[PDB]
Design a protein around this ligand. Structure first.
Ligand SMILES: CCCCCCCCCCCCCCCCCC(=O)OC[C@H](COP(=O)([O-])OCC(O)COP(=O)([O-])OC[C@@H](COC(=O)CCCCCCCCCCCCCCCCC)OC(=O)CCCCCCCCCCCCCCCCC)OC(=O)CCCCCCCCCCCCCCCCC
Ligand SMILES: CCCCCCCCCCCCCCCCCC(=O)OC[C@H](COP(=O)([O-])OCC[N+](C)(C)C)OC(=O)CCCCCCCCCCCCCCCCC
Ligand SMILES: CCCCCCCCCCCCO[C@@H]1O[C@H](CO)[C@@H](O[C@H]2O[C@H](CO)[C@@H](O)[C@H](O)[C@H]2O)[C@H](O)[C@H]1O
Ligand SMILES: CCCCCCCCCCCCO[C@@H]1O[C@H](CO)[C@@H](O[C@H]2O[C@H](CO)[C@@H](O)[C@H](O)[C@H]2O)[C@H](O)[C@H]1O
Ligand SMILES: CCCCCCCCCCCCO[C@@H]1O[C@H](CO)[C@@H](O[C@H]2O[C@H](CO)[C@@H](O)[C@H](O)[C@H]2O)[C@H](O)[C@H]1O
Ligand SMILES: N=C(N)NC(=N)NCCc1ccc(I)c(Cl)c1
Lengths: 60, 97, 459, 51, 63, 170, 171
């Protein structure tokens, strides 16, 4: 029983490292692409709700 | 075929006229009665009801009444409307067109 | 929520490591302590919900359902231990384990912030429930009842899975707190009609909606008593709870998409109430009574008004305790006469006086006698549907007449008249049975003194 | 006692769960004393507003 | 039936009577808080916003 | 006891007894018995309890909520600002419910107090009730169970647009 | 199932009771009860059974026309005001088996004599079954009649639930 736990933990530790590395790589790739293509990811100008118009749908 | 017969139904009162219906073992039967009655009635229902009765202002219902009194006193003293149709200040709003 | 999840999990090693004859004593005692601690969830604020972490949250809707869920486990254990007395020990422990795992899934289902997490746990409740019915049910038909229960649910849930994943891609999140702020109106199109249906039909089958209900009477007739208690008290409410949450993101399309389901529920409640007058099986009668009551909940949820959401929440809690009580009352007769036929054993008030009082109290709550929370919930729904359309008062009024008729007819047929001559094994009520009945009705009637805690977030 | 040791499992589960709930709050202090509604100056010997 | 009702009455009174006595002693010899203005420069504890001692105790202890 | 301005009452006008009979009034002697046997022992018990409360005097306060920017000042989808604005709107919504309850209680007390003259004598309470109900209805009615500050604002802007158009045509 | 004589006598009793409900007063009833008896005696000796049947058939149509819409009913007869009134107080004897020993201790003499009846029932049962078995034609009984005990020391077959039925005013 001791080796069952140890075996799972040992293998699980390295799979967790690779998992975290692959998501870090995914974020690293995504931010670089956004940085290199600012025209496709413009910083839109946000408006406030006082300015934006939303239709009212009464529940009656 | 090679099947056991259907057993006859057992009346727990025959072997134990004092049975509480919990177990055929009299000592276990009594203990199981006590936990149900003590943790069920003495604790959960009695202490739980007391706990619920003294909840500190469930969902600030009491605070809202005190707050409403404060606003009504202030707004009537100063000749303001008790309540306004507009929830949001129109000076902060910008209608289309 | 970990202060409830972990102790619930600990009930499993507790059961398996208990002495052979202390499995019922230990699991019942400690699941009552958990139920006691569940009252700490009453720390509810007037503006903010109680948001514990990224995964779990409670508000006024989930809190009463959580307390009902955790209170029902000890009751299911007392209800089950008699008819499982001849089972071998390992199989008794497995039965208790299925009940514990069902509670674990339920308390996580009601507190999940993220809707896919809700979906998975909402779906996970199927497995133990199916196992309980098919493994520990009594008769041959339990295998078919398991199949109808499984596939009715999956026929609805799988489209819901597609819709939820679609929603996250478009919106970017399924966290319910985020959806409260990022929600956008649903515009008219055929794409959104099917998105609306995929978001709702799974919960409708759970309620169940009239026309999708025929699985419920089969399941109840076949399930063991604990299966019936959890099915009626909590599992039906997963549909109600799901609809109460997901309707946030279906506006304004719900304004017209609700009509076919309001007509089914408004008419369905009259038909199921009338059906109750002619049922011959006592468990089947109570199952049809549940469909009638849950029809109001569907209507209340669909018309989306503060009063109806308060009525829906109160009805869900009141129905849970009442219907679970009725099944326990019916079961106690069954454990004596081994038949569910309502006409078989009559005049039982003459032989079991106190148990006849439990029948009377249970029936009075079922027909919603003021000021029970059963009436408060029903009255609030009737008030709100009157504003929706004045004509509905006629359908609501007729249902209240028929509901009183079958509630008392069930009481009169089984408890009054002349006792059946040849039935001579009607032994006196056990302390376990009387305690089981009073642990339903006493919390139910105590809630009348403080209804606000079951009126939900709109209070 | 070996007869009644099982009766600490659920109570210890509750204490452990209560414990883990409180540590989980410590990962959610990004806005402690930073909300517009409740922001204020620290009390003379106070180290944090809540924990 | 008589035994069950006797047992039910005993276990409700087992904690009910002490709770009823405890509430009475608390109300007499402790009493409720008196509404006061928040003193300038003072930050009340969150459990100081409730009037009844049991409610304050519940808020201070659990919530 | 309570703020007399928030819950006003007129000055009571009782008429002095003006007997026109020789028979003793049984109510007068019952009042003396009630005062001696009921009120006096009750008052003594309360005075004892009041002494204990004085020995242990402590305070509780009324929570004050700082105003925060409202939903009109929140950028679209900026959840952190929308959250504070939304929680504030909900608090005010619960306060306005209690303001209407205060005005309704004034109306109900006036109707009972004025007896058969209530239709004439309760006009001011009735008019104030009518106004606060109108204002409350404009703010919150028809928002649905999933109401929010956003929907409240959308309703107000719809009303403002109809008011602007009506004046434009006028 | 009913013979012609039985049908006539049932009509005669039925008509008198409805006549009594119309008349109310005893002297008035006695007078008209005699006229009615005279009509029945006018055809007592009719030997032609075809004519006799027609007379019976016509008398039944006459009764239906002239029956009281609200005839007198004895209080405890079916449809009477006291019918079934005391069924709620009738408790079967087998319930005493389930009494707690402390309840049984309050009636030591009653329960001693009760054991003597249960013993009598046990020791009689095999004879009762065997008597019915040897007195029943091959194709089962043709009627619901039961036989008497034939020997001394025997009890009539199937007696327990008749002998020990609840009293008519059991409380
Ligand atoms: C069951 C549910 C259990 C839930 C838990 C209990 C929680 C709880 O106790 O709260 C309740 C409440 C206690 O509230 P509390 O918040 O603790 O009191 C705070 C006060 O500031 C406390 O102020 P106080 O200092 O004045 O109170 C102390 C008081 C004693 O007060 C108490 O301690 C009462 C303790 C009650 C124990 C639980 C009951 O001192 C006395 O001894 C008074 C004696 C006067 C006689 C001389 O007590 C009750 O309500 C019990 C009944 C009260 C008297 C009822 C009077 C008759 C009612 C007439 C109206 C109805 C009309 C008739 C209708 C009939 C139908 C047709
Ligand atoms: C008259 C008696 C006096 C009285 O009213 O009592 C005071 C109160 C009501 O009066 P009150 O609201 O004015 O409170 C009195 C106390 N002060 C003055 C401080 C406010 O009684 C109660 O609150 C009783 C609450 C009972 C509800 C809880 C029942 C136990 C729940 C157990 C959980 C398991 C059951 C399943 C639950 C299902 C989901 C919720
Ligand atoms: C390498 C990591 C391994 C981690 C292992 C951690 C737990 C290890 C436990 C080892 C000791 C188990 O020892 C074993 O336990 C069970 C219950 O506890 C006992 O057997 C049990 O049978 C029944 C229940 O099935 C009960 O009567 C009672 O619970 C007990 O008698 C055995 O008599 C004992 O031999
Ligand atoms: C019926 C049994 C129910 C058991 C559950 C209730 C247990 C708690 C019982 C009340 C305990 C005392 O409750 C507590 O009393 C003191 C006042 O004396 C209050 O404390 C306040 O006043 C005291 C003075 O006494 C000062 O320290 C200070 O001004 C402030 O802390 C607390 O805010 C209140 O919560
Ligand atoms: C319905 C009944 C529920 C029964 C629950 C049974 C489990 C009991 C769990 C007890 C947990 C108590 O845990 C701890 O208790 C102490 C007092 O003792 C509190 O003490 C603290 O309260 C507040 C917290 O801001 C502060 O005044 C201060 O930090 C301290 O006084 C802690 O806030 C609480 O975290
Ligand atoms: N072909 C596809 N659509 N899928 C796919 N593999 N996309 C690549 C995008 C991706 C996703 C997750 C991670 I972690 C990383 Cl590093 C990269």
């Amino acid at each position: 029983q001791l080796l069952y736990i140890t075996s799972f933990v040992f293998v699980g530790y390295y799979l967790l490292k690779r998992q975290d590395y692959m998501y870090a790589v995914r974020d690293h790739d995504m931010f670089s692409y956004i940085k290199s293509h600012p025209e496709d990811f413009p910083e839109k100008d946000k408006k406030t709700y006082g300015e934006v118009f939303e239709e009212f749908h009464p529940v009656r | 075929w090679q099947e056991d017969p259907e057993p006859e139904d057992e009346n727990l009162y025959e072997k134990n006229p004092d049975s509480h219906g919990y177990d055929k073992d009299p000592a276990v039967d009594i203990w199981n009665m006590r936990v149900v009655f003590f943790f069920g009635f003495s604790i959960v229902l009695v202490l739980g009801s007391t706990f619920v009765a003294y909840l500190p202002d469930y969902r600030m219902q009491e605070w809202a009444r005190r707050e409403a009194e404060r606003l009504v006193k202030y707004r009537e003293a100063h000749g303001l409307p008790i309540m306004e149709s507009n929830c949001f200040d129109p000076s902060k709003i910008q209608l289309p067109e | 929520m970990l202060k409830y999840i972990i102790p619930t999990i600990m009930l499993m090693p507790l059961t398996w490591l208990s002495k052979n004859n202390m499995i019922w004593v230990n699991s019942t005692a400690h699941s009552l302590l958990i139920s006691f601690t569940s009252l700490l969830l009453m720390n509810q604020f007037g503006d903010n919900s109680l948001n514990f972490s990224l995964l779990f949250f409670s508000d006024s809707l989930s809190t009463p359902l959580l307390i009902l869920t955790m209170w029902l486990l000890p009751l299911m254990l007392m209800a089950s231990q008699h008819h499982l007395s001849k089972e071998n020990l390992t199989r008794k422990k497995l039965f208790i384990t299925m009940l514990i795992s069902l509670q674990l899934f339920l308390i996580m289902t009601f507190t999940a912030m993220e809707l896919i997490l809700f979906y998975i746990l909402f779906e996970a409740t199927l497995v133990p429930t199916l196992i309980i019915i098919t493994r520990w049910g009594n008769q041959t038909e339990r295998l078919n009842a398991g199949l109808y229960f499984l596939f009715y649910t999956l026929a609805g849930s799988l489209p819901l899975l597609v819709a939820l994943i679609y929603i996250q891609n478009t919106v970017g999140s399924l966290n319910f707190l985020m959806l409260q702020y990022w929600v956008q109106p649903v515009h008219n199109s055929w794409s959104n009609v099917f998105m609306w249906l995929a978001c709702m039909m799974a919960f409708m089958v759970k309620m169940p909606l009239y026309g999708l209900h025929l699985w419920l009477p089969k399941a109840h007739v076949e399930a063991p008593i604990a299966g019936s208690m959890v099915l009626a008290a909590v599992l039906l409410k997963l549909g109600g709870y799901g609809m109460l949450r997901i309707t946030l993101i279906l506006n304004p399309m719900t304004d017209f998409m609700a009509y076919p389901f309001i007509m089914l529920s408004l008419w369905g409640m009259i038909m199921t109430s009338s059906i109750c007058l002619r049922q011959t099986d006592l468990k089947s009668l109570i199952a049809y009574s549940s469909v009638s009551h849950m029809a109001l909940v569907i209507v209340a949820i669909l018309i989306q008004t503060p009063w109806s959401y308060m009525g829906a929440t109160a009805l869900m809690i009141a129905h849970g305790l009442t219907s679970s009580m009725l099944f326990c009352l019916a079961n106690s007769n069954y454990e004596r006469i081994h038949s569910r036929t309502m006409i078989l054993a009559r005049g039982l008030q003459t032989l079991l006086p106190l148990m006849a009082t439990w029948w009377l109290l249970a029936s009075l709550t079922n027909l919603a006698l003021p000021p029970t929370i059963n009436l408060i919930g029903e009255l609030f729904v009737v008030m709100s549907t009157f504003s929706w359309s004045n004509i509905t008062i006629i359908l609501m009024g007729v249902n209240m007449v028929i509901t009183a008729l079958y509630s008392l007819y069930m009481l009169i047929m089984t408890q009054r008249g002349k006792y059946t001559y040849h039935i001579n094994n009607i032994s006196p009520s056990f302390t376990r049975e009387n305690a089981l009945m009073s642990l339903h009705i006493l919390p139910l009637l105590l809630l009348t003194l403080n209804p606000k805690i079951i009126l939900g977030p709109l209070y | 006692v070996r007869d009644h040791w099982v009766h600490v499992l659920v109570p210890m589960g509750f204490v452990f769960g209560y414990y883990l709930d409180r540590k989980n709050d410590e990962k959610l202090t990004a806005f402690r004393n930073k909300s517009l509604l409740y922001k204020r100056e620290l009390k003379p010997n106070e180290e944090v507003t809540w924990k | 039936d008589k035994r069950f009702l006797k047992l039910l009455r005993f276990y409700i009174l087992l904690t009910g009577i002490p709770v009823a006595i405890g509430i009475t002693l608390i109300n007499v010899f402790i009493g409720e808080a008196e509404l006061a203005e928040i003193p300038e420069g003072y930050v009340p504890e969150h459990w100081e916003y409730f009037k009844h001692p049991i409610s304050r105790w519940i808020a201070r202890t659990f919530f | 006891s309570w703020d007399k301005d928030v819950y006003p009452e007129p000055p009571r006008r009782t008429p002095a007894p003006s007997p026109q009979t020789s028979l003793p009034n049984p109510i007068t002697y019952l009042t003396k018995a009630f005062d001696l046997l009921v009120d006096r022992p009750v008052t003594l018990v309360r005075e004892f309890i009041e002494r204990q409360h004085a020995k242990n005097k402590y305070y509780y306060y009324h929570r004050e909520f700082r105003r925060v920017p409202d939903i009109t000042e929140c950028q679209e989808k900026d959840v952190l600002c929308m959250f504070e604005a939304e929680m504030q709107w909900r608090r005010d919504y619960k306060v306005d419910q209690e303001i209407v309850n205060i005005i309704q209680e004034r109306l109900k007390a006036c109707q009972q107090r004025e007896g058969e003259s209530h239709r004439q004598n309760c006009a001011k309470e009735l008019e104030q009730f009518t106004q606060v109900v109108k204002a409350y209805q404009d703010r919150y009615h028809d928002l649905g169970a999933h109401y929010s500050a956003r929907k409240c604002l959308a309703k107000q802007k719809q009303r403002m647009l109809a008011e602007r158009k009506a004046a434009k045509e006028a | 199932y009913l013979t012609h004589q039985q049908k006539v006598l049932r009509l005669y009793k039925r008509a008198l009771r409805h006549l009594e409900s119309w008349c109310i007063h005893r002297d008035k009833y006695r007078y008209f009860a005699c006229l009615l008896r005279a009509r029945f005696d006018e055809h007592k000796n009719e030997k032609d059974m075809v004519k006799a049947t027609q007379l019976l058939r016509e008398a039944e149509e006459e009764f239906w026309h002239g029956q009281h819409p609200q005839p007198y009913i004895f209080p405890e007869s079916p449809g009477g005001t006291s019918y079934e009134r005391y069924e709620c107080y009738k408790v079967p004897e087998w319930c005493l088996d389930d009494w707690h020993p402390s309840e049984k201790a309050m009636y030591p003499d009653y329960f001693a004599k009760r054991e003597q009846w249960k013993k009598l029932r046990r020791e009689s049962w095999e004879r009762e079954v065997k008597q019915l078995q040897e007195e029943t034609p091959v194709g089962g009984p043709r009627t619901e009649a039961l036989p008497p005990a034939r020997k001394q020391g025997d009890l009539p077959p199937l007696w327990w639930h008749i002998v020990t039925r609840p009293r008519e005013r059991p409380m």
